[PDB]
Amino acid sequence: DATQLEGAYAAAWLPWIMIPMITYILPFPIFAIAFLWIEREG
Amino acid sequence: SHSVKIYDTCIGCTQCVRACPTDVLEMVPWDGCRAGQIAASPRTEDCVGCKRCETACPTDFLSIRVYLGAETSRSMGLAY
Amino acid sequence: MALSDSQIFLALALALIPGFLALRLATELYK
Amino acid sequence: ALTGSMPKFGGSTGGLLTAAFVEERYAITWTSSKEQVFEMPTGGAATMNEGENLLELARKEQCLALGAQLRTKFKPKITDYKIYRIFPNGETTFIHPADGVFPEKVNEGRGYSGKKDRRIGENPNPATIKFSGQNTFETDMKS
Amino acid sequence: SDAYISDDPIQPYQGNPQLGNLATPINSSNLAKAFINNLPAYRPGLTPFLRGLEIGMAHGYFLVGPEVVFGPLKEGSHGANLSGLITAIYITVSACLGISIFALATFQGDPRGTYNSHSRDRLRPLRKKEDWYQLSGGILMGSLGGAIFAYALLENFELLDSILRGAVNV
Amino acid sequence: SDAYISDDPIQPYQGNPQLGNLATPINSSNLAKAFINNLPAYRPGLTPFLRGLEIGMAHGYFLVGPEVVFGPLKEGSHGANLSGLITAIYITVSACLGISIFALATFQGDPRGTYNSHSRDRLRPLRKKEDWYQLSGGILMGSLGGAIFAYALLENFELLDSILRGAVNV
Ligand code: CLA
Ligand code: CLA
Ligand code: CLA
Ligand code: CLA
Numbered sequence: 001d002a003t004q005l006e007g008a009y010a011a012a013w014l015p016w017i018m019i020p021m022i023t024y025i026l027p028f029p030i031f032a033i034a035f036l037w038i039e040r041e042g
Numbered sequence: 043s044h045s046v047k048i049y050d051t052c053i054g055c056t057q058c059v060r061a062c063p064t065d066v067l068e069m070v071p072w073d074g075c076r077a078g079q080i081a082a083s084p085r086t087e088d089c090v091g092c093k094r095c096e097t098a099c100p101t102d103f104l105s106i107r108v109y110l111g112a113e114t115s116r117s118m119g120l121a122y
Numbered sequence: 123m124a125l126s127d128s129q130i131f132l133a134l135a136l137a138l139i140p141g142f143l144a145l146r147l148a149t150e151l152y153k
Numbered sequence: 154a155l156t157g158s159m160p161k162f163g164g165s166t167g168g169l170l171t172a173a174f175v176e177e178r179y180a181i182t183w184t185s186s187k188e189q190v191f192e193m194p195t196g197g198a199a200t201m202n203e204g205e206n207l208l209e210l211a212r213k214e215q216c217l218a219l220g221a222q223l224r225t226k227f228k229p230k231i232t233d234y235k236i237y238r239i240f241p242n243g244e245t246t247f248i249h250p251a252d253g254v255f256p257e258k259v260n261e262g263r264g265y266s267g268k269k270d271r272r273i274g275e276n277p278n279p280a281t282i283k284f285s286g287q288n289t290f291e292t293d294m295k296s
Numbered sequence: 297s298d299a300y301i302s303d304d305p306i307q308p309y310q311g312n313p314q315l316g317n318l319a320t321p322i323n324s325s326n327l328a329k330a331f332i333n334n335l336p337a338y339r340p341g342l343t344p345f346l347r348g349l350e351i352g353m354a355h356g357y358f359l360v361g362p363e364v365v366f367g368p369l370k371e372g373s374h375g376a377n378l379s380g381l382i383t384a385i386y387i388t389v390s391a392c393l394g395i396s397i398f399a400l401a402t403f404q405g406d407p408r409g410t411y412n413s414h415s416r417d418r419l420r421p422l423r424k425k426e427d428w429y430q431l432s433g434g435i436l437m438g439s440l441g442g443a444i445f446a447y448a449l450l451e452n453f454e455l456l457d458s459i460l461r462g463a464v465n466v
Numbered sequence: 467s468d469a470y471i472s473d474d475p476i477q478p479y480q481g482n483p484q485l486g487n488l489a490t491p492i493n494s495s496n497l498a499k500a501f502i503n504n505l506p507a508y509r510p511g512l513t514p515f516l517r518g519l520e521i522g523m524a525h526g527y528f529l530v531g532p533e534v535v536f537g538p539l540k541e542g543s544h545g546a547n548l549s550g551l552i553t554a555i556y557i558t559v560s561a562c563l564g565i566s567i568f569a570l571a572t573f574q575g576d577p578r579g580t581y582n583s584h585s586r587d588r589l590r591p592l593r594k595k596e597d598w599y600q601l602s603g604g605i606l607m608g609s610l611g612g613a614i615f616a617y618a619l620l621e622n623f624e625l626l627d628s629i630l631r632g633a634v635n636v
């Protein structure tokens with residue numbers, strides 16, 4: 001029946017790439033950008 | 043740095059100066075009380091904020107107040 | 123009836139307007 | 154530039170770290186009449202030499218804790234200690250005693266540096282110094 | 297009386313008893329120093345890129361294994377080696393992004409702490425940001441290469457096994 | 467009368483109205499500068515090798531795709547990914563040969579144009595030939611690695627697909 005993740009909805013390939021980007025690809029760049037922002041010197 | 047303020051209810055008992063672990067306080071001549079002395083806080087860049095000076099004060103209310111302010115590496119008591 | 127792929131892509135493209143308006147308001151409020 | 158033998162001590166993990174050499178170090182010098190054991194403010198027991206001793210510590214509070222130990226835990230008292238602040242360029246600054254007496258006594262010439270002629274319960278109440286920058290004790294009036 | 301008057305195995309660090317360390321056999325013996333001081337982080341004379349390259353090779357190599365044996369793909373050989381390879385790749389890229397942003401944040405004017413010009417830390421010898429960027433590039437290159445070398449040895453384990461048993465001499 | 471008497475959004479470049487540029491929102495806003503000045507070509511402090519390494523990684527990665535989808539081998543997965551990989555490899559080696567010969571021809575004595583010692587170009591900061599050779603080596607290393615990383619992700623697309631659908635948790 002459900003051997004893997006599926007989408008019975010329109011553009012069901014979008015979770016497949018959106019969950020990696022939002023959750024483990026773009027976050028460490030965002031953390032690096034915020035760390036460089038809070039540690040930059042006057 | 044913290045702000046240590048001394049008010050005119052001071053009686054020059056020196057107990058705040060003796061209780062300071064970091065030597066912020068000293069006694070200066072006043073002629074505003076009969077001891078002839080009043081506390082002063084010039085080296086308030088050294089103040090850690092322990093408020094031992096306030097615990098040592100006998101006047102009600104206190105003649106010395108410490109206001110914890112901007113934290114530096116000296117007021118945080120950091121040996122690292 | 124169910125939504126189409128083009129209806130999801132319209133949403134994705136149209137949310138770029140609040141997405142960059144939000145960035146403009148965030149930088150106008152000056153961190 | 155500072156005179157004195159380092160006290161006889163085996164070393165500890167409680168001593169100087171990076172911040173000693175990149176921010177500031179303190180030194181305390183004192184003269185003892187005999188070679189005798191004191192407690193390091195960093196933990197442990199060291200031996201002060203007969204004569205002039207010089208010890209580098211990380212904080213001014215450690216130098217003042219040692220000095221309070223010297224003048225209270227020893228008979229005769231050691232009251233001639235001097236505390237200096239050492240900067241990373243090597244610059245040494247004599248800080249304690251700031252005058253040359255001892256803060257607990259009263260010297261003619263020190264000068265007021267925290268005095269506020271008030272009575273605490275009459276600071277300006279905060280509604281009036283809102284968008285000013287001053288906060289309630291760094292002011293000049295009395296309400 | 298006895299405080300540094302008898303000569304013991306544990307000495308003050310660098311002969312200074314007011315330093316916050318002790319000279320114990322683990323940080324001061326000839327074997328411990330000969331091992332540590334010749335590790336790529338501390339080997340004398342090396343450029344930061346070569347230090348980082350050797351650190352990365354050694355690191356990306358062993359980082360493949362934990363997910364090959366324990367990962368979600370462990371029931372099958374090919375997927376297990378791929379999951380270990382991409383885990384090593386991700387950990388390498390995250391660690392090198394951290395090295396780069398450490399160098400970016402630390403070396404701003406005269407740095408604070410051990411990378412200040414007045415610092416006496418013997419255990420942190422990369423004093424310049426150029427050293428840190430060369431190290432980051434080297435660790436990235438070496439670690440990604442060592443990870444794919446471990447991956448290639450695990451993918452061809454059937455061949456490497458038949459070789460090391462002499463099964464190729466028929 | 468009105469020529470630089472009213473204060474407009476478009477200013478002279480660097481406050482100099484006799485320079486051949488204008489300060490528009492695309493070359494002078496805080497968002498545009500924050501993006502461009504922190505790109506690896508312009509990020510402050512970086513060694514040329516690390517600049518080139520990150521440029522190459524990003525570049526060799528996307529250069530695999532056009533031939534995978536559109537190439538002569540596109541009717542089959544394995545050959546399409548191989549044609550994309552070798553296209554990225556060839557474009558990388560050609561571009562880095564060009565970087566090397568640009569540095570070889572330009573930096574001869576005092577160079578002419580923007581790499582002359584008197585040049586004021588803010589947009590071309592690799593003033594030395596050593597910077598250009600370190601950049602060429604880094605772009606080559608990073609681009610060949612990013613190309614084979616994209617190739618390895620496309621070869622194992624069946625596995626990466628079953629992973630990202632949770633099909634490996636049976
Ligand atoms: C209703 C929500 C709200 C609103 C209207 C504001 C509005 C404002 N904030 Mg803010 N803020 C918020 C929520 C909000 N904040 C929350 C929940 C936090 C805690 C994280 C903060 C922490 C914060 C700080 C430290 C500062 C502000 C500041 C400001 C002012 C300047 C604008 C700005 O820089 O953006 C705000 C900057 C941010 C970074 C907002 C954080 C956005 C979210 C919460 C972070 C989530 C990150 C997440 C891990 C993403 C990673 C994954 C990714 C791939 C999706 C402005 C008036 C700045 C100021 O000048 O004060 C006057 C200032 O420096 N805020
Ligand atoms: C704030 C409302 C909101 C919330 C809580 C979510 C939550 C979610 N979305 Mg969704 N989304 C939203 C609005 C929202 N969405 C809108 C308005 C659109 C139309 C463009 C979409 C389009 C969208 C797609 C295509 C997908 C999701 C998906 C998801 C799921 C995974 C996370 C993700 O991939 O993000 C992806 C987000 C986007 C592509 C655009 C997000 C735009 C919103 C408006 C940002 C909201 C910012 C917020 C207001 C600021 C808060 C500040 C801070 C303090 C938190 C998650 C349950 C995934 C899913 O379905 O999982 C199975 C999926 O792939 N969303
Ligand atoms: C969770 C912990 C964990 C787990 C599950 C593993 C799992 C694994 N490790 Mg690993 N490892 C770990 C922690 C772990 N390790 C730690 C903490 C270290 C110390 C840093 C190591 C160091 C290590 C090394 C050096 C090797 C492994 C190898 C392996 C693989 C076993 C051999 C094999 O499958 O094929 C059989 C073996 C082969 C097919 C190759 C045989 C080895 C060749 C002939 C020589 C390798 C070069 C050699 C290291 C050069 C030395 C350089 C210099 C020091 C002289 C396996 C998947 C091996 C491997 O990765 O295979 C590719 C391997 O060589 N591990
Ligand atoms: C520390 C506790 C712990 C341990 C041992 C594990 C272990 C494991 N987890 Mg788990 N996990 C944990 C906590 C833990 N988890 C928590 C708190 C959560 C959230 C609730 C999860 C959520 C989670 C999920 C969703 C999954 C796992 C999975 C796994 C498995 C593979 C993951 C892996 O190998 O990563 C890689 C490990 C490394 C890259 C490095 C390992 C550390 C090395 C070995 C240290 C070696 C030090 C060395 C000895 C010192 C050297 C000394 C020197 C002198 C040489 C593995 C058996 C996966 C699985 O499929 O299960 C089978 C999986 O999908 N975990």
Ligand code: CLA
Nearest residue numbers: 020025026029527528531532534535536616619620623626
């Ligand atoms: C002719 C134009 C053209 C064509 C035909 C393609 C075709 C392709 N592109 Mg490409 N691309 C193009 C132009 C083009 N591109 C341009 C102009 C850019 C901007 C520079 C990109 C940037 C780009 C990226 C970033 C990626 C692609 C990918 C792909 C492949 C699609 C996904 C896939 O097959 O498997 C499905 C996807 C996967 C198997 C991997 C999923 C992505 C993982 C989870 C994360 C990737 C790492 C991420 C980029 C890290 C970000 C770093 C930093 C920015 C934060 C495909 C062959 C993907 C790819 O190459 O796959 C290897 C991909 O990741 N393209």
Ligand SMILES: CCCCCCCCCCCCCCCC(=O)OC[C@H](COP(=O)(O)OC[C@@H](O)CO)OC(=O)CCCCCCCCCCCCCCC
Nearest residue numbers: 026137138141142144145148149152153495496497499500
């Ligand atoms: C939600 C989908 C995925 C999220 C990924 C992106 C998340 C945000 C990434 C942050 C990059 C911004 C860097 C600003 C860089 C910049 O321009 O600096 C501007 C300002 C300070 O800049 P300075 O004045 O120092 O600029 C000087 C130099 O730039 C040159 O003079 O920084 C901020 O305002 C921080 C506040 C931003 C707060 C952001 C939160 C608002 C949410 C925005 C939503 C974005 C959606 C975009 C896609 C539609």
Ligand SMILES: CC1=C(/C=C/C(C)=C/C=C/C(C)=C/C=C/C=C(C)/C=C/C=C(C)/C=C/C2=C(C)CCCC2(C)C)C(C)(C)CCC1
Nearest residue numbers: 331353354355357358437438440441442443444445446448
């Ligand atoms: C402390 C000690 C110990 C330990 C040790 C250890 C920890 C180990 C190890 C180990 C290891 C961990 C090793 C490693 C390694 C490695 C290697 C050997 C590498 C490599 C590589 C390569 C060769 C790569 C290549 C490449 C590149 C780079 C590019 C492209 C791709 C390729 C693949 C080609 C003991 C106790 C025992 C004793 C002694 C001392």
Ligand SMILES: CC1=C(/C=C/C(C)=C/C=C/C(C)=C/C=C/C=C(C)/C=C/C=C(C)/C=C/C2=C(C)CCCC2(C)C)C(C)(C)CCC1
Nearest residue numbers: 385437440441444523524525527528607608611612614615
């Ligand atoms: C402007 C902009 C944009 C765009 C962006 C883009 C254009 C993108 C992209 C992207 C990309 C294009 C990305 C990339 C990447 C990459 C990577 C991630 C890499 C890698 C790699 C690796 C990891 C490699 C490795 C190796 C080596 C080196 C050696 C040996 C082999 C191997 C494989 C291991 C938008 C509008 C959206 C928004 C924002 C801004």
Ligand SMILES: CC1=C(/C=C/C(C)=C/C=C\C(C)=C\C=C/C=C(C)/C=C/C=C(C)/C=C/C2=C(C)CCCC2(C)C)C(C)(C)CCC1
Nearest residue numbers: 130131132133134135136137138140141142144145147148
């Ligand atoms: C264009 C195009 C496209 C694409 C699209 C895409 C790829 C996208 C994306 C994306 C998206 C869809 C996005 C978005 C967004 C974001 C947002 C929407 C946001 C937000 C937020 C907010 C609202 C903010 C808030 C705040 C404030 C206010 C301040 C600060 C703090 C905070 C952060 C809290 C298509 C093909 C379809 C169509 C054609 C063309």
Ligand code: SF4
Nearest residue numbers: 062089090092093095
């Ligand atoms: S708060 Fe502590 S350190 Fe500060 S003046 Fe009072 S007693 Fe001295």
Ligand code: SF4
Nearest residue numbers: 052053055056058099
């Ligand atoms: S303890 Fe109080 S009353 Fe005594 S000298 Fe100090 S401030 Fe004055």
